[PDB]
Design a protein around this nucleic acid. Structure first.
Lengths: 64, 49, 48
RNA sequence: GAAAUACCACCCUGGCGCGGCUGGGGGCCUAACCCUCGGAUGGGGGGACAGCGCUUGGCGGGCAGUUUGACUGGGGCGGUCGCCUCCUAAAAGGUAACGGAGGCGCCCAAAGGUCCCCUCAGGCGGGACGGAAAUCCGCCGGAGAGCGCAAGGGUAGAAGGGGGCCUGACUGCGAGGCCUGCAAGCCGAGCAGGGGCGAAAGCCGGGCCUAGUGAACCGGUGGUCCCGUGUGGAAGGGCCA
RNA sequence: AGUGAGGGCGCGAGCGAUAACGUCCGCGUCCGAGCGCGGGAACAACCGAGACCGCCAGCUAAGGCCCCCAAGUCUGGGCUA
RNA sequence: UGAAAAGCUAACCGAGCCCGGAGAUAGCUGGUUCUCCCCGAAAUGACUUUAGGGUCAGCCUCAGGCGCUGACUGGGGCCU
RNA sequence: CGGAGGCGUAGGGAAACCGAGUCCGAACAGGGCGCAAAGUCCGCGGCCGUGGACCCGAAACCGGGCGAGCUAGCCCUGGCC
RNA sequence: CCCGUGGUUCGUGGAGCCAUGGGGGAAUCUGGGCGGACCACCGCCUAAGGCUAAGUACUCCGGGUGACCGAUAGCGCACC
RNA sequence: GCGGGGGGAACCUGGGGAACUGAAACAUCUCAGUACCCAGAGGAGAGGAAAGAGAAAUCGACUCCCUGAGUAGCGGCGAG
């Protein structure tokens, strides 16, 4: 009966501050290919896209 | 695989920094420079295959 | 859409270092005994 | 002589000596096993084989269960499906079309830094080996030659041509903006550590710029030295690169 | 919450034969989805016009007034026959 | 089975008929019900084994708050 | 009446943990805040997720049975030409 | 204990314990599996036999109650 | 001289054990150990005194309810 988040989601990053938000590793590109190099590698803080992150939310709601 | 192969720099056992590079013209010749997070800057060296 | 850095592996038995947020403010503002309360006495306490 | 010689030490090569390990194969049986005898529980033929149990590798439609893309002035066959540039976007920006055109899925170890110098093609006139066109002299020139690579923008007040010295084609990072609904991709003063080009006023966090690009999973390696399912460690594993 | 395909007309480029109630995009209107009234014979999108409901009331669009059918077989000046 | 075309197999088995999974599945069609009042959609974007589907963007409605901020107009820069 | 609980009551982090502070970090620069601005429960209701979830609608796949007085075959056994 | 497999929140994995199909192939309480793949610890339990009550299931059959139905709903079936 | 067998709506134990549909394809996966064939003990069987739990120098048969988190986690880490 209890739904329970795209557990998956909760798992793959997918984090919330009960304030009303979430984030995933900047994940812009990184930790994958990258015969890239430096400065580019400057993107690993965290990030969050609004609008959309609702589904995410309620799917989750209950734990993570 | 082409005269373009990827290497990267490491420094006197006290770190390693990265970046790709090539193969063509002077091939192997690979000292270079760069600076690790070792100490404050430091040679580094480069090479590392 | 994204690698990840949070991995909670093959298991089920973690340790502890009890992080229960308690407040000297609820405490002294109006629900205490300025010297001895202890986890034990915190039931009413909204920090358990 | 590269070595010195006795007789006592250890250690090897050996094609042959011998010994422990184990790989290859050739002979009637025999008692399990099979067929068995032909009129009987005893005889007969085969017999360590293959029958057969399990694990092994491999043939393998005979069988099973799926799939074998979208666009497109029908379907299919034909085209074609990512990115840069120009046109049509009609003047902000910005838009199809089986509309026009045309390139890229490299690299450049130094076209990466900075300091110092220089400065086009082509026209003309005069000249050794020339000899429509090198090389040098003499004038002339919104710079149309030039900048790996296509276009377009720019632009020799050089980003362009030459010399010196050098790695920032740095880590930590960034405020604040381009565009975009998603994610993208993209622009960046300035603070820190840390260097390099000038003495320095400062430039340098790759190139003259707009294409050389790919989530997520999965797994590798150089860390790290965070976690370990009683504790010490460890298989294993979390974040970095 | 619903459409995620639509068509028409005018202007501006494609295309197509500068052909089609063709198909491509854009500025506008449109028509659906109101676009139910006038209307041009009758005609989803061409000019007029937005209908909450009445009137055995009057002024008007467009576009009309010999008749079929409301409205001058007006006047004035021509030109075709 | 089958002197085999894909034949016949309780009157139409190119894989029988009854019951069962089951009310399979159904971006496809149908059908989708009292009165009245307000507003008023789009029939486009973006990637999609999607392309008559869908997630997000564009337009709508009811509620809070901002409350003169809007289309359009006047004027004067700096853009074509 | 039953007080195992689940939601609040700081959170920040992959964690070690720190703690209203915080991870990056050697960085005084950013992002999660701090900001309580209390929720928590019962109901009524717009509303998804699982369950057939506006309703009846198919090709068919799978299990267990049902039949050679269906039909073709083959076996046994008389007859007729 | 080797591989071949079942369980289990485990789908192949660092993957444990019980459980068995193959081959190996033993210990009597200093015994032996179990906590941590595994190794050094402490701890745990005592395996490879046996018996059954009691608390949740089920509905043929009986009783009773129903903001559960009225003869096309109700079991299809209110009566050969 | 005994026993069984033969039943029985549902519950029940073990025996053996499937496509759909989902994963908008679908081969791991999925429905699921679900449907169904079976054998069998009952009036209820099932399980039922620990080579258990769990790490506190702790508990103590087995079964069923509420809670334990839908977390701990299993995985074309995707539907689930």
């Amino acid at each position: 009966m209890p739904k329970m988040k795209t557990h998956k989601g909760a798992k793959k990053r997918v984090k919330i501050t009960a304030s009303g938000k979430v984030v995933a590793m900047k994940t812009g590109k990184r930790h994958l290919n990258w015969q890239k190099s430096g400065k580019e590698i400057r993107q690993k803080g965290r990030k969050f896209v609004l609008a959309k992150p609702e589904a995410e939310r309620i799917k989750l709601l209950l734990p993570y | 695989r082409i005269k373009l192969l990827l290497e990267c720099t490491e420094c006197k056992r006290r770190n390693y920094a990265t970046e790709k590079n090539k193969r063509n013209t002077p091939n192997k010749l690979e000292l270079r420079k760069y600076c690790p997070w070792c100490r404050k800057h430091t040679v580094h060296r480069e090479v590392k295959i | 859409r994204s690698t990840t850095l949070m991995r909670l592996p093959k298991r089920g038995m973690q340790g502890q270092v009890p992080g229960e947020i308690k407040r000297p403010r609820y405490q002294g503002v109006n629900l205490k005994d300025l010297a001895r309360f202890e986890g034990e006495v915190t039931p009413e306490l909204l920090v358990r």
